[PDB]
mmCIF file of C-alpha atoms in Angstrom:
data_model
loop_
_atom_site.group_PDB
_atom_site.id
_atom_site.type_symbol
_atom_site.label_atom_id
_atom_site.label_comp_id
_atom_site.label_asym_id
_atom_site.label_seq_id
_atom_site.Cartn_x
_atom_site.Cartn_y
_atom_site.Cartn_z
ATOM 1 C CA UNK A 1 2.948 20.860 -25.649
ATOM 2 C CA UNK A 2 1.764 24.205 -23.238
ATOM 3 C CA UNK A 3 -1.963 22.987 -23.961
ATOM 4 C CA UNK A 4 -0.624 19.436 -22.692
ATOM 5 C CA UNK A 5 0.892 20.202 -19.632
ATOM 6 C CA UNK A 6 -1.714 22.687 -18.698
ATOM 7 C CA UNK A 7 1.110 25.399 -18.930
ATOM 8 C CA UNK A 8 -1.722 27.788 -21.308
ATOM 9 C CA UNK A 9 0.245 29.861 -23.703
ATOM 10 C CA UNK A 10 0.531 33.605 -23.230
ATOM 11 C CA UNK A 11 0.144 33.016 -19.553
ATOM 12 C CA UNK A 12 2.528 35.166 -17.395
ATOM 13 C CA UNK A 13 2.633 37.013 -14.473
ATOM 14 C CA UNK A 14 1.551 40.662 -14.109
ATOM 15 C CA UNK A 15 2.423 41.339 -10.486
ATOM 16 C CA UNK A 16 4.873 39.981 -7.622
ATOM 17 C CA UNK A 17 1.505 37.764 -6.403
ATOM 18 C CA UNK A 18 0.499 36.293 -9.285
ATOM 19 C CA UNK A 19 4.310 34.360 -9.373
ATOM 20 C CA UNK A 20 3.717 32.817 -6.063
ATOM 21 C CA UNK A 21 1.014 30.931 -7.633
ATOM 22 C CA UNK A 22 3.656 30.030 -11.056
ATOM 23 C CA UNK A 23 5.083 28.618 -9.020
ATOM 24 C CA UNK A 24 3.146 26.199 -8.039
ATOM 25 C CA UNK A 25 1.812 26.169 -12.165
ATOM 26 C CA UNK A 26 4.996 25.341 -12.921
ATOM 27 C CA UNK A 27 6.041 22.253 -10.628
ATOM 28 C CA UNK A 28 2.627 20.428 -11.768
ATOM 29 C CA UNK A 29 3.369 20.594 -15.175
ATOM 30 C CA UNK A 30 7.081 19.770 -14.275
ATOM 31 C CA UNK A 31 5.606 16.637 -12.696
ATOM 32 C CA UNK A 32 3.375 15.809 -15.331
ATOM 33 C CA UNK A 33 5.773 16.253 -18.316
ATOM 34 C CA UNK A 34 8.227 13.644 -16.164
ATOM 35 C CA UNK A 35 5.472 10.929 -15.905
ATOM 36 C CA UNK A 36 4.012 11.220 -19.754
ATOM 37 C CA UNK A 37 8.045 10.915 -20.612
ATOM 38 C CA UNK A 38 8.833 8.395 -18.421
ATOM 39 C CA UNK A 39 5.244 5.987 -19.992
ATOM 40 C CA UNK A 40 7.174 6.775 -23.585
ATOM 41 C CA UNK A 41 10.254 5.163 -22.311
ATOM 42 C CA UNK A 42 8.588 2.118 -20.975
ATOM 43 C CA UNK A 43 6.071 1.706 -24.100
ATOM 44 C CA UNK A 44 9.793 1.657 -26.200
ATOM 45 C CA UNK A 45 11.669 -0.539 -24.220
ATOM 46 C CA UNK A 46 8.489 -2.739 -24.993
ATOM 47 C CA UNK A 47 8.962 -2.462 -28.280
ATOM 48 C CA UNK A 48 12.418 -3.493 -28.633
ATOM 49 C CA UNK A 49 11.657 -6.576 -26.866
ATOM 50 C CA UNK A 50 8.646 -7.991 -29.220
ATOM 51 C CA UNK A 51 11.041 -7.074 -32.015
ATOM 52 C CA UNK A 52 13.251 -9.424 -30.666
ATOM 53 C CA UNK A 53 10.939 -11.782 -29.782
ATOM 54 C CA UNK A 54 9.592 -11.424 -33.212
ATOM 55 C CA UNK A 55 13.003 -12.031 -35.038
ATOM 56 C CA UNK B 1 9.362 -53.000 -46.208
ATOM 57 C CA UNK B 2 6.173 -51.547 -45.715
ATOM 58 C CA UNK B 3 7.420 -50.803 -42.424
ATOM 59 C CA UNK B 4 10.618 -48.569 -43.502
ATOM 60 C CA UNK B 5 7.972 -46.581 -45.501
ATOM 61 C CA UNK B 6 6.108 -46.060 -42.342
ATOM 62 C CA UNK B 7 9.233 -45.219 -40.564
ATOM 63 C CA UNK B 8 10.036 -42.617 -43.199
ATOM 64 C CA UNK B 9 6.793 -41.306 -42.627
ATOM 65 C CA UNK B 10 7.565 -41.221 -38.711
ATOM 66 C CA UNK B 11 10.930 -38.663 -38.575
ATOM 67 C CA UNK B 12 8.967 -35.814 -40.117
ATOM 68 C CA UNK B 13 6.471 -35.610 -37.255
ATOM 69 C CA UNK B 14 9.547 -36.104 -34.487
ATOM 70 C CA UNK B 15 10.828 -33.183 -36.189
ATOM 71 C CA UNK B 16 7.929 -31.183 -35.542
ATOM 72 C CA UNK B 17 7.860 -31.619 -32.230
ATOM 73 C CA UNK B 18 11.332 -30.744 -31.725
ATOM 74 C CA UNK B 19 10.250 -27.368 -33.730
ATOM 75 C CA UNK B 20 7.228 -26.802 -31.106
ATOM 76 C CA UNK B 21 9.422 -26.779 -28.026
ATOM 77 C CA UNK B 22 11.944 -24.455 -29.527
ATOM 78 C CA UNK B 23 9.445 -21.617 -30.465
ATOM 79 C CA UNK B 24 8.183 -22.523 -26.615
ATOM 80 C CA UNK B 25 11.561 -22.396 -25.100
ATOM 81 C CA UNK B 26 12.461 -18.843 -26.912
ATOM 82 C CA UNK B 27 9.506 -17.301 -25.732
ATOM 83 C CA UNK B 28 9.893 -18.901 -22.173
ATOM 84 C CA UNK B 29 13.305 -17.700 -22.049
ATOM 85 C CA UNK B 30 12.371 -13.782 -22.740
ATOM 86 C CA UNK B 31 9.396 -14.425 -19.996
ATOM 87 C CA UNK B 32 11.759 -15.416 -17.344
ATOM 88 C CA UNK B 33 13.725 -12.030 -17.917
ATOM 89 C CA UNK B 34 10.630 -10.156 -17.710
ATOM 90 C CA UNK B 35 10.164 -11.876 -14.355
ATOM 91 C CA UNK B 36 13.489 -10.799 -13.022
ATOM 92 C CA UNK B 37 13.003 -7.313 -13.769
ATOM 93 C CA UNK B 38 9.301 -7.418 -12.542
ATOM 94 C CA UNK B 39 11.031 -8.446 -9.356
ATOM 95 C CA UNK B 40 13.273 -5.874 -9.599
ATOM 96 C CA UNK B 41 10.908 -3.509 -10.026
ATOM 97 C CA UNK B 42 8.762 -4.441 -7.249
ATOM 98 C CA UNK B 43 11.273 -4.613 -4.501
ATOM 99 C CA UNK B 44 11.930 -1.406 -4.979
ATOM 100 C CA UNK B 45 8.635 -0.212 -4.729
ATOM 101 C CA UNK B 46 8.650 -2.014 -1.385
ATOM 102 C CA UNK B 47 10.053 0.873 0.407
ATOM 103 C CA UNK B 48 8.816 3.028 2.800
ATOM 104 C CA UNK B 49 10.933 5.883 2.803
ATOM 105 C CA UNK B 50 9.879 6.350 -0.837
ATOM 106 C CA UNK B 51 8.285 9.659 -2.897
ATOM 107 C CA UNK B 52 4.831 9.541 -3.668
ATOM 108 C CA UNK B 53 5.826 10.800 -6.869
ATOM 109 C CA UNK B 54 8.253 7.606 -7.516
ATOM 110 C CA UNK B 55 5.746 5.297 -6.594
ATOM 111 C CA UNK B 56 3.695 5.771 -9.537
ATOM 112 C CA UNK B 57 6.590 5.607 -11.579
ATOM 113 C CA UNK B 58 7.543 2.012 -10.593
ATOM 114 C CA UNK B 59 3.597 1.058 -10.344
ATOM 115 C CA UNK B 60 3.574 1.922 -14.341
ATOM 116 C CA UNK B 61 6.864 0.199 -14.905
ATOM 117 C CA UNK B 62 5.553 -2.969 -13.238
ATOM 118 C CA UNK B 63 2.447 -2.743 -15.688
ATOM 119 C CA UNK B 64 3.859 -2.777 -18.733
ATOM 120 C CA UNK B 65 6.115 -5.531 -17.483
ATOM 121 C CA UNK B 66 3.333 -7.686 -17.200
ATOM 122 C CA UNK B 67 1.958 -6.618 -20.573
ATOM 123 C CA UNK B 68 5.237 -7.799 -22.165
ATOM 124 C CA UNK B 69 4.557 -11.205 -20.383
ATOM 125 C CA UNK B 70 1.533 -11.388 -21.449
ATOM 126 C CA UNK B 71 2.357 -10.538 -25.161
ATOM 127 C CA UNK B 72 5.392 -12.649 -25.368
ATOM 128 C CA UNK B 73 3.212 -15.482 -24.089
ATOM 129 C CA UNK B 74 0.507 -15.907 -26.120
ATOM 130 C CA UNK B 75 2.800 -14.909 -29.906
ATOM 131 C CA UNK B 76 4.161 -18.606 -29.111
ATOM 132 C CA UNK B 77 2.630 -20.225 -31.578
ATOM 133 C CA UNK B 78 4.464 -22.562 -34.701
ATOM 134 C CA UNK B 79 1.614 -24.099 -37.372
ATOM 135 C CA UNK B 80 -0.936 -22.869 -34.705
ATOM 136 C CA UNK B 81 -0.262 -25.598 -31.940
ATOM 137 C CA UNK B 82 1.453 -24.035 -29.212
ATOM 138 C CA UNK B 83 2.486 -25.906 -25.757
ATOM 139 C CA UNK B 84 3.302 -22.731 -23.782
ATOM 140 C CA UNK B 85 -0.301 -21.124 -24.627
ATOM 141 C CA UNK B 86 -2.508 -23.154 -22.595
ATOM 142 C CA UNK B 87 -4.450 -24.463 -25.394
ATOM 143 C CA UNK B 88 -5.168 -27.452 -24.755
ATOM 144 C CA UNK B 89 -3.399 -30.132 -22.477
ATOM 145 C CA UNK B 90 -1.001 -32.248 -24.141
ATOM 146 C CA UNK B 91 0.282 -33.419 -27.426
ATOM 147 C CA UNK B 92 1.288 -36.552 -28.738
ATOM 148 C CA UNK B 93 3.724 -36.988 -31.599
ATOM 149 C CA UNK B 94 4.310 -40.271 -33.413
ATOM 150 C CA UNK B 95 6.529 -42.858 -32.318
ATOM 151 C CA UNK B 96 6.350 -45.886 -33.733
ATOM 152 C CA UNK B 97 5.231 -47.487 -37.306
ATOM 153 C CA UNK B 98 2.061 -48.711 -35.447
ATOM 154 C CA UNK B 99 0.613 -45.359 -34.330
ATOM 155 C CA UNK B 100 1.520 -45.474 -30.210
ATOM 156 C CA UNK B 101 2.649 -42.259 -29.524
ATOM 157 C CA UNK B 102 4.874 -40.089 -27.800
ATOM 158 C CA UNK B 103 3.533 -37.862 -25.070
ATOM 159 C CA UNK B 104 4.211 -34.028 -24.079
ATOM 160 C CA UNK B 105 2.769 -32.418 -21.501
ATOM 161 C CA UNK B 106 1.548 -28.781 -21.857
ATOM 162 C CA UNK B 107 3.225 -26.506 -19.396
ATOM 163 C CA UNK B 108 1.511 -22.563 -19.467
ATOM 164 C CA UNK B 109 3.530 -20.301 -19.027
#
């Protein structure tokens, strides 16, 4: 969520300097969105397999 | 006749064993795939000409690789005795009406 990725709701930009630091906002919380998605992908394809295993 | 008795008594513990290694081989099987892809995963990580942002991502990968391992390692278990565990070293099943036994080896995995 905004609090998650550090994005900070109602957040914007007031001037044509205050975007050239968005920016930068912006590609962290890119970043950091891709790696938290990319753990819930592993953690499910580790699921699946105990459930195999299980069965 | 005695004996036959005994012998009856004999199969059912045979059987067992034969149950043991299954369970051991199952689980043994799904760690050598884990393996594969843990290979996988870190020969790509090898390279140099790599993001430092992809790095991570294959670090993290690799970790919950060896989770699985672990996990699918230790779950190996069928009436508690286990030979894939590491409990303990060996187990010996019956073999004959007289009580000398056939021997198994543990092998950890």
């Amino acid at each position: 969520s905004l609090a998650g990725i550090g994005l900070t709701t109602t957040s914007t930009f007031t001037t044509a300097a205050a975007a050239k630091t968005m920016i930068g906002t912006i590609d962290t919380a890119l970043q950091t969105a891709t790696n938290k998605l990319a753990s819930l992908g592993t953690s499910s394809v580790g699921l699946d397999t105990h459930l195999t295993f299980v069965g | 006749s005695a004996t036959a008795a005994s012998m009856n008594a004999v199969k059912d513990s045979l059987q067992r064993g034969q149950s043991t290694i299954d369970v051991a081989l199952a689980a043994g099987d799904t760690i050598t795939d884990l393996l594969g892809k843990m290979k996988e995963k870190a020969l790509a990580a090898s390279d140099t000409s790599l993001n430092t942002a992809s790095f991570n991502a294959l670090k993290s990968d690799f970790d919950s690789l060896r989770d699985q391992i672990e996990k699918a390692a230790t779950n190996a278990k069928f009436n508690g005795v286990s030979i894939a565990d590491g409990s303990t070293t060996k187990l010996t099943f019956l073999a004959n009406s007289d009580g000398s036994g056939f021997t198994v080896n543990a092998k950890t995995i």
